[PDB]
Amino acid sequence: GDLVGVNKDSYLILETLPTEYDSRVKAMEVDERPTEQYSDIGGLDKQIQELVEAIVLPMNHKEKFENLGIQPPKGVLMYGPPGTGKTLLARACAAQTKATFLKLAGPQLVQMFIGDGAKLVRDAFALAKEKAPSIIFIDELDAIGTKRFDSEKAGDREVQRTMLELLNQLDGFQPNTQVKVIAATNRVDILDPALLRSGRLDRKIEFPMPNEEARARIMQIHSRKMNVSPDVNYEELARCTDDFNGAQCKAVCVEAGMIALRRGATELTHEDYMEGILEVQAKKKANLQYYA
Amino acid sequence: TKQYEKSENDLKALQSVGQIVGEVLKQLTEEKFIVKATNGPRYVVGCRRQLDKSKLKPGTRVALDMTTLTIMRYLPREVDPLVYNMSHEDPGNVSYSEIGGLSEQIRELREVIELPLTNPELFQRVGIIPPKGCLLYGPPGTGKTLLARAVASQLDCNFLKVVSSSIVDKYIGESARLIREMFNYARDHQPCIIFMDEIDAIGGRRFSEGTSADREIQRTLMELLNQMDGFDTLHRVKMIMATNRPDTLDPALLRPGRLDRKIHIDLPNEQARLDILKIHAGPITKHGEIDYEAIVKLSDGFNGADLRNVCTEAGMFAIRADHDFVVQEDFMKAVRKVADSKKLESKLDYKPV
Amino acid sequence: SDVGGCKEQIEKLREVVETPLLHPERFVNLGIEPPKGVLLFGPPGTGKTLCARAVANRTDACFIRVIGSELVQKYVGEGARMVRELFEMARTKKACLIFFDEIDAIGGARFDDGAGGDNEVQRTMLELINQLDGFDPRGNIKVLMATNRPDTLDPALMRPGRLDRKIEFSLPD
Ligand SMILES: Nc1ncnc2c1ncn2[C@@H]1O[C@H](COP(=O)(O)OP(=O)(O)OP(=O)(O)O)[C@@H](O)[C@H]1O
Numbered sequence: 001g002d003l004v005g006v007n008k009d010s011y012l013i014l015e016t017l018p019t020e021y022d023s024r025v026k027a028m029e030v031d032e033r034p035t036e037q038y039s040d041i042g043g044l045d046k047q048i049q050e051l052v053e054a055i056v057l058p059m060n061h062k063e064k065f066e067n068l069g070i071q072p073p074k075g076v077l078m079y080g081p082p083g084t085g086k087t088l089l090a091r092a093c094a095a096q097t098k099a100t101f102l103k104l105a106g107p108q109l110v111q112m113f114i115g116d117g118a119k120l121v122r123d124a125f126a127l128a129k130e131k132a133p134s135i136i137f138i139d140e141l142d143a144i145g146t147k148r149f150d151s152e153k154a155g156d157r158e159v160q161r162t163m164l165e166l167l168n169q170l171d172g173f174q175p176n177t178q179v180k181v182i183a184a185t186n187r188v189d190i191l192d193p194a195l196l197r198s199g200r201l202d203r204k205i206e207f208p209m210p211n212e213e214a215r216a217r218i219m220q221i222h223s224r225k226m227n228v229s230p231d232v233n234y235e236e237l238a239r240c241t242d243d244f245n246g247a248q249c250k251a252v253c254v255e256a257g258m259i260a261l262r263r264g265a266t267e268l269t270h271e272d273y274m275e276g277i278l279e280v281q282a283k284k285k286a287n288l289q290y291y292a
Numbered sequence: 293t294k295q296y297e298k299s300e301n302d303l304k305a306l307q308s309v310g311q312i313v314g315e316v317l318k319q320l321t322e323e324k325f326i327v328k329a330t331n332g333p334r335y336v337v338g339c340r341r342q343l344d345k346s347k348l349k350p351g352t353r354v355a356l357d358m359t360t361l362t363i364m365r366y367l368p369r370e371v372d373p374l375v376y377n378m379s380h381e382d383p384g385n386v387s388y389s390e391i392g393g394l395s396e397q398i399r400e401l402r403e404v405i406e407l408p409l410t411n412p413e414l415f416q417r418v419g420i421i422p423p424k425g426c427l428l429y430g431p432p433g434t435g436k437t438l439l440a441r442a443v444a445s446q447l448d449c450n451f452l453k454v455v456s457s458s459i460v461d462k463y464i465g466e467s468a469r470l471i472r473e474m475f476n477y478a479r480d481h482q483p484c485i486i487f488m489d490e491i492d493a494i495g496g497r498r499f500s501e502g503t504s505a506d507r508e509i510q511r512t513l514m515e516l517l518n519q520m521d522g523f524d525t526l527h528r529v530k531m532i533m534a535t536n537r538p539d540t541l542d543p544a545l546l547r548p549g550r551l552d553r554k555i556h557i558d559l560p561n562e563q564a565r566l567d568i569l570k571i572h573a574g575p576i577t578k579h580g581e582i583d584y585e586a587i588v589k590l591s592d593g594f595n596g597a598d599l600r601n602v603c604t605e606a607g608m609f610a611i612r613a614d615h616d617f618v619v620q621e622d623f624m625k626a627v628r629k630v631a632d633s634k635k636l637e638s639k640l641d642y643k644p645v
Numbered sequence: 646s647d648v649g650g651c652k653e654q655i656e657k658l659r660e661v662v663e664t665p666l667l668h669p670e671r672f673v674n675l676g677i678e679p680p681k682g683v684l685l686f687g688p689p690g691t692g693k694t695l696c697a698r699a700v701a702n703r704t705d706a707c708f709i710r711v712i713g714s715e716l717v718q719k720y721v722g723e724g725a726r727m728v729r730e731l732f733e734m735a736r737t738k739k740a741c742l743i744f745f746d747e748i749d750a751i752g753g754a755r756f757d758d759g760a761g762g763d764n765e766v767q768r769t770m771l772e773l774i775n776q777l778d779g780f781d782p783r784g785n786i787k788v789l790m791a792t793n794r795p796d797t798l799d800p801a802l803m804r805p806g807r808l809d810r811k812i813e814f815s816l817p818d
């Protein structure tokens with residue numbers, strides 16, 4: 001082992017101390033909880049039913065599995081253009097799990113020396129196995145999950161090598177059956193094709209553009225705190241939302257407050273809504289002509 | 293009450309300081325031993341009369357005094373990661389039957405792996421030298437670490453576990469000398485078996501001259517390749533290797549001698565898919581009606597993994613139906629659909645040879 | 646007054662930084678929320694000069710200029726530590742601001758066949774957006790983005806969620 005406590009010239013160990021290491025690698029993230037919850041999002045009830053399934057059923061319903069003889073899922077792929085807003089989904093419901101949760105950034109595994117990210121991930125899954133059950137969320141896997149093609153050289157060949165080491169922690173060793181690890185990627189373009197498995201990436205859900213119902217719903221959730229003059233269609237602007245991301249509905253609210261300021265009006269109005277819509281999308285400008 | 297005093301008397305013996313390790317380079321005389329510390333400095337010392345001078349020998353791990361810097365006690369060999377290479381565990385045995393195919397590969401590695409151990413006579417009579425190495429590659433299919441894993445836990449004897457990410461070592465690629473020392477302890481516990489997972493990275497081509505990492509990686513590769521170019525008899529040690537793409541592995545590894553055999557996994561035939569589906573239908577409680585040819589007709593080109601995840605997908609979709617025993621109609625639905633989603637995410641499964 | 650007559654531009658990119666920073670209580674009253682960050686681009690005239698104006702009219706808390714090329718370095722993984730630790734600094738500097746010029750050099754999207762290529766560029770920019778997508782703060786420090794060409798799309802499809810207030814030049818009246 002290591003860490004055994006010995007005093008200078010004594011070269012004898014009074015006490016054997018644990019545990020492990022190290023600083024940023026030890027604690028990448030220790031999450032109390034983010035305040036948001038699944039009630040703040042809308043339109044995902046089916047895919048958030050799939051998520052709440054994959055994360056919740058090992059926690060409380062493990063007895064059901066042992067009755068049916070079920071192997072629960074581990075890797076669950078999360079993809080879609082923002083937004084979506086899958087990060088608030090995973091971290092919101094992660095705050096609803098009450099179980100141990102560790103955030104992680106994909107490019108963090110890119111390091112200065114050869115294969116530091118390897119011992120990094122091993123330390124991660126070691127503290128995860130210590131805190132079991134737990135949940136680890138990673139994003140931008142495609143940043144470090146591009147296997148390239150052929151030598152030379154993949155500067156991440158060590159990093160993606162550590163990814164294939166995660167596939168070894170999911171391959172040659174079963175114990176990862178506890179502490180489900182969730183992953184998210186904005187684009188599925190590049191992948192390790194071996195990532196398909198129940199212990200690896202299993203439930204894979206496309207996150208589409210929200211629908212006018214869901215768009216006006218979630219945008220109404222962003223504007224529900226602010227003072228709004230009680231005349232809003234949400235139908236008019238719900239149809240006026242075309243190709244919008246839900247995040248651009250947030251931007252519609254934010255702009256509604258912005259010009260709501262310069263107007264001097266104490267309460268938000270519908271002309272302000274359609275105004276901000278025109279503001280963020282679509283862009284500008286040219287001039288009104290030729291179409292009469 | 294008195295046992296405590298026994299411990300405290302042990303402390304009186306702990307007033308003796310730990311000695312300093314070292315190696316024996318040569319010996320100039322009986323009172324002049326040419327030694328080196330594991331930390332680098334070299335020394336020449338005499339020693340006491342409790343030694344046997346012939347027992348010393350050059351290249352010997354010894355312990356030295358803190359002042360006289362001379363041998364009192366000595367130990368032959370030590371290695372930290374070895375017992376951890378031996379600590380791998382896998383169930384089966386029976387999983388060696390659970391995997392289904394591939395039969396001729398199963399029996400093939402059983403012969404070239406297990407048979408030189410038990411029966412060197414059959415080989416030494418015909419005049420053929422036993423093959424010392426083999427290669428596995430997925431995921432054109434999959435089951436590499438499964439199959440070979442159940443060979444390690446099947447044949448038992450002595451076996452060594454290696455992940456390619458433990459040879460990183462950061463400074464001073466002496467994980468190379470950990471391959472040397474590791475091969476020496478494989479010569480200690482011989483016969484032994486060697487796993488090699490993800491051999492692409494530790495098999496690279498050094499095609500384009502670049503940076504540092506690639507160069508020292510290639511250096512540890514020179515250690516590997518020249519230790520399979522011996523100058524040594526690797527008959528008693530076995531080596532199993534698995535990687536995604538048999539492309540970047542360089543002609544040195546692709547050359548026989550170093551790597552004698554080449555075996556692959558392929559996408560399971562509907563026969564083997566049928567079988568692995570059978571053994572995956574066992575642990576799951578099912579309704580009285582079961583028809584496997586439905587899933588066999590529907591499921592085509594999956595990995596064995598994708599097939600067992602398809603079974604788990606059936607059951608975990610059936611936790612919504614809340615039924616304990618589940619019909620295979622729900623299995624046809626969820627298995628079929630979600631399986632075809634896996635096939636929409638099945639992009640670029642086509643690998644070299 | 647060194648502005649060349651651009652008003653709507655200077656008005657929006659002004660109220661987006663001064664007004665929330667000068668009079669924070671105003672928005673807290675009407676809150677809602679002011680947007681995270683902004684974007685500038687167009688022909689060279691005049692880029693980066695209105696930034697100098699933000700320097701002048703800057704009242705109290707300092708702001709950190711960041712040129713585009715100092716992110717990219719050889720021996721990969723350096724610019725990552727860089728951008729991260731400057732974000733930690735800005736989280737120490739309480740309401741201090743950041744500006745980025747020449748972002749089009751480091752935000753080249755998306756990829757090529759191989760071998761890369763964008764992989765260091767990608768991990769640095771996508772890593773930047775990764776720091777941008779954590780819930781905290783984020784950042785109460787705003788940001789500022791000025792470049793030539795609006796491409797590429799990956800940072801431009803990652804901005805509108807967090808960032809906003811994209812304004813274009815204009816160019817002489
Ligand atoms: N369908 C939706 N329901 C609720 N909120 C949404 C929705 N779509 C967008 N948002 C909002 O958009 C904002 C921006 O989130 P964003 O889309 O950047 O997260 P994300 O895309 O999951 O993260 P990343 O960009 O790392 O993938 C969030 O604050 C979120 O509240």
Ligand SMILES: Nc1ncnc2c1ncn2[C@@H]1O[C@H](COP(=O)(O)OP(=O)(O)OP(=O)(O)O)[C@@H](O)[C@H]1O
Pocket residue numbers: 167170171193194195196197390391392393430431433434435436437438439568595596597598600
């Ligand atoms: N022929 C098979 N029989 C039984 N299980 C299989 C078979 N092939 C694959 N699997 C399943 O695949 C999972 C991973 O084992 P395996 O050694 O195939 O990983 P791998 O080949 O390294 O995966 P990849 O090649 O995709 O990285 C195991 O849980 C195993 O149950």
Ligand SMILES: Nc1ncnc2c1ncn2[C@@H]1O[C@H](COP(=O)(O)OP(=O)(O)OP(=O)(O)O)[C@@H](O)[C@H]1O
Pocket residue numbers: 647648649650651687688689690691692693694746792793
């Ligand atoms: N509209 C304007 N108002 C005031 N000064 C201007 C204007 N247009 C150009 N100038 C002057 O012209 C000079 C050149 O413009 P500047 O170099 O600031 O743009 P730029 O830095 O080339 O833009 P970019 O950063 O996109 O390359 C500036 O010093 C500025 O004083």
